[PDB]
Amino acid sequence: TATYSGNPFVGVTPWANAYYASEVSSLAIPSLTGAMATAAAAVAKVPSFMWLDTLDKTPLMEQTLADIRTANKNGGNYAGQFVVFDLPDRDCAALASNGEYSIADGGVAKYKNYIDTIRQIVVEYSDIRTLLVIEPDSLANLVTNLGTPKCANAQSAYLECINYAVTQLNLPNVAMYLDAGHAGWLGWPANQDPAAQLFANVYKNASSPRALRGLATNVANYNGWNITSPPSYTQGNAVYNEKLYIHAIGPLLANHGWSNAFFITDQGRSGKQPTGQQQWGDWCNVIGTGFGIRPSANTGDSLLDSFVWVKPGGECDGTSDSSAPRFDSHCALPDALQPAPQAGAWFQAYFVQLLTNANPSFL
Ligand SMILES: *[C@@H]1O[C@H](CO)[C@@H](O)[C@H](O)[C@H]1NC(C)=O
Ligand SMILES: *[C@@H]1O[C@H](CO)[C@@H](O)[C@H](O)[C@H]1NC(C)=O
Ligand SMILES: *[C@H]1O[C@H](CO)[C@@H](O)[C@H](O)[C@@H]1O
Ligand SMILES: *[C@H]1O[C@H](CO)[C@@H](O)[C@H](O)[C@@H]1O
Ligand SMILES: *[C@H]1O[C@H](CO)[C@@H](O)[C@H](O)[C@@H]1O
Ligand SMILES: *[C@H]1O[C@H](CO)[C@@H](O)[C@H](O)[C@@H]1O
Ligand SMILES: *[C@H]1O[C@H](CO)[C@@H](O)[C@H](O)[C@@H]1O
Ligand SMILES: *[C@H]1O[C@H](CO)[C@@H](O)[C@H](O)[C@@H]1O
Ligand SMILES: *[C@H]1O[C@H](CO)[C@@H](O)[C@H](O)[C@@H]1O
Numbered sequence: 001t002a003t004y005s006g007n008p009f010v011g012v013t014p015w016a017n018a019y020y021a022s023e024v025s026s027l028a029i030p031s032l033t034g035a036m037a038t039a040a041a042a043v044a045k046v047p048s049f050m051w052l053d054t055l056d057k058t059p060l061m062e063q064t065l066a067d068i069r070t071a072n073k074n075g076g077n078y079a080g081q082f083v084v085f086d087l088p089d090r091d092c093a094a095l096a097s098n099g100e101y102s103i104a105d106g107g108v109a110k111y112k113n114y115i116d117t118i119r120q121i122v123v124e125y126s127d128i129r130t131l132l133v134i135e136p137d138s139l140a141n142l143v144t145n146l147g148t149p150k151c152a153n154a155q156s157a158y159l160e161c162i163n164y165a166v167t168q169l170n171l172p173n174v175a176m177y178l179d180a181g182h183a184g185w186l187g188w189p190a191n192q193d194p195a196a197q198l199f200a201n202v203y204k205n206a207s208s209p210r211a212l213r214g215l216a217t218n219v220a221n222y223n224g225w226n227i228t229s230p231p232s233y234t235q236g237n238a239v240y241n242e243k244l245y246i247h248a249i250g251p252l253l254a255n256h257g258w259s260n261a262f263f264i265t266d267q268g269r270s271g272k273q274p275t276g277q278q279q280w281g282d283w284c285n286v287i288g289t290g291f292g293i294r295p296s297a298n299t300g301d302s303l304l305d306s307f308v309w310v311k312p313g314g315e316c317d318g319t320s321d322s323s324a325p326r327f328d329s330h331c332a333l334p335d336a337l338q339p340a341p342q343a344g345a346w347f348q349a350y351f352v353q354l355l356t357n358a359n360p361s362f363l
Helices: 018-031 034-043 055-073 107-124 149-168 189-205 242-255 348-356
Strands: 050-052 078-084 130-134 174-179 212-217 262-266 304-308
Touching: 018 034, 018 055, 018 348, 034 348, 050 055, 055 078, 055 107, 107 149, 130 149, 149 174, 149 189, 189 242, 212 242, 212 304, 242 262
Parallel strands: 050 078, 078 130, 130 174, 174 212, 212 262, 262 304
Antiparallel strands: none
16 A cells, blocks of 8 residues: 555545644644634644754654554554655745855755765655655745856756655655746746656656656645636736646646646645735735645546645744745735744744635634
């Protein structure tokens, strides 16, 4: 049951990790009352992805897989879900990056060690199907942000590191999905082909890895999956939702050598449409959002393997504190909820917002 054919989401149930469940029960619930905290308890049972944003997060991955092995040894049929996110000079186009490795200070070698560490864990838990999202906010920058010096200089490192990750994690119990931005980034007509070309090149350059199932879209973003009317901030783009995006880029990938590419789409913060975004490019702790379509493989779509919740709702995108290190001005915009703590830290007011605006509702 660890190995699979076709859609890796079919035949298993994604695991709802203890890490996120702890945050909800210990940081959120003690502050909620009645209907609200009962609804919060339910959110903790919805499976979401765990982010390995630092090397010191790897022991947590092993800990999670141990829990799953027991659950399965205890009759479960669960699969792990993780995000590989520690590229050197990470988020090259961002005003502030929390990435621990730098290309200038042997970041490529450090990244390979990080991948070697993850591989050993996956080989150790060969009995568990592991679903992985590979490096969000990486390759998309190579399509539109080469005008930014940091991205231009990180191009070779990004491609070398991604090749290593994809080849070293190419195992029977693994299913990988390369991050491919979203409709508002690569969905624009002029960006579709250049993007398809790059992703197809990465695939073929890694010798068409069996484990590389396809692409992941809308990660940590808020686009709707199949909304019938275009939000004002999408003006000028015919591809205004994720469904239109994957169906546009799908055939293009085939034209470039990558046939049979499938997709997964983040809907964890897409429940309320339109959102409170004043501009499509606004990504930090956006106001007017809610939990969206629940994770499921019954997508009613030919290209979507599953709806997923990659970015865990409640965990901060970045701080709004100007006197704080790693401060990004995008988190201080009128459509960003404030005050916001450090990236990854629990953001209670944001969690309550998502819970209140949820669709399907939890209340
Ligand atoms: C192909 O793989 C090599 C490493 O073997 C890497 O250096 C190169 O950047 C990759 N090229 C592309 C287009 O992915
Ligand atoms: C959008 O997708 C959801 C989930 O598959 C479905 O319930 C809904 O009917 C769809 N709406 C439209 C307009 O296609
Ligand atoms: C998935 O594939 C493995 C071998 O790669 C088999 O042992 C298993 O039964 C399933 O077919
Ligand atoms: C996880 O749990 C679901 C129940 O919704 C099963 O259908 C699946 O086979 C796995 O055991
Ligand atoms: C359970 O785990 C979460 C995530 O680390 C903590 O925030 C919480 O305090 C508890 O230890
Ligand atoms: C944290 O713990 C509480 C109480 O056990 C649960 O209700 C919640 O779902 C989460 O697991
Ligand atoms: C959240 O963390 C607290 C300890 O800080 C636990 O008591 C609780 O059960 C949950 O794991
Ligand atoms: C729950 O959230 C409240 C804020 O509404 C905090 O005061 C409390 O410490 C807990 O984090
Ligand atoms: C939500 O509902 C549950 C079930 O009655 C309660 O235990 C909780 O206190 C909240 O009111």
